[PDB]
């Protein structure tokens, strides 16, 4: 999967409007490799943690947590939340091949971020489809 | 190796009644306290459920999970997660730190609002921490 012209200009303004609702810090599109396809940080936010490691590490993720995804009965999980203390995070499928994070603090609350999450994962998702047919 | 807590005697049934009430009030299918080895430490599932997945390998599956995040964890400034939610079109599973060395893990379905798993699961979690700290 490759963003560039319009759809990535249209996944960028996703994710701007997304972070705008949520109060989220760090929005990113990512494949499941972990490659970084578009990616919007909150103004107000600190800069953020290196977001290649950050989208390495949760491609890993979402590849095994699928041995525990079978056992429940599904080819694996469609969202996880991982909520530390302070930070969390929020993952969705944008169809088929893609991931939305969103990192958040305490500052967003979690239903706006799932919310807006899940309609945000819709968007990026159609993007996605357009550009790879 | 043997577990990082055993539960037995009084500790034990309250843990078990804990797991049964949370089952009740949440509407999820199975409830269980494990280690961070992967070991069932007390488990109950609810009476109208069917026969659950193997239990050990689900425990070990979110135990092995439970060691994987602390690299992303640390990555976003924390030592580890305290709670995790994986939500399949129609399972789902709760994770939630009871105390240092153990979890509770509540598996559910559809019918198990998510709001009522997460508000139960935290106060479950909580009454586990102090029956394992002890
Ligand atoms: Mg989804
Ligand atoms: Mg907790």
Known sequence: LVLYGAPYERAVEVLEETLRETGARYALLIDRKGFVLAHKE??????????????????????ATQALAKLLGEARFQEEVHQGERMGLYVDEAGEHALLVL?????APLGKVKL?????????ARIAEEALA
């Open 103 to 107: 990192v958040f603090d305490e500052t």
């Open 42 to 63: 909150a103004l107000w936010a600190p800069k953020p943690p290196p977001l290649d490691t950050l989208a390495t590490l949760v491609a890993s993720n979402a590849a």
């Open 116 to 124: 807006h999450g899940k309609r945000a994962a819709e968007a990026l």
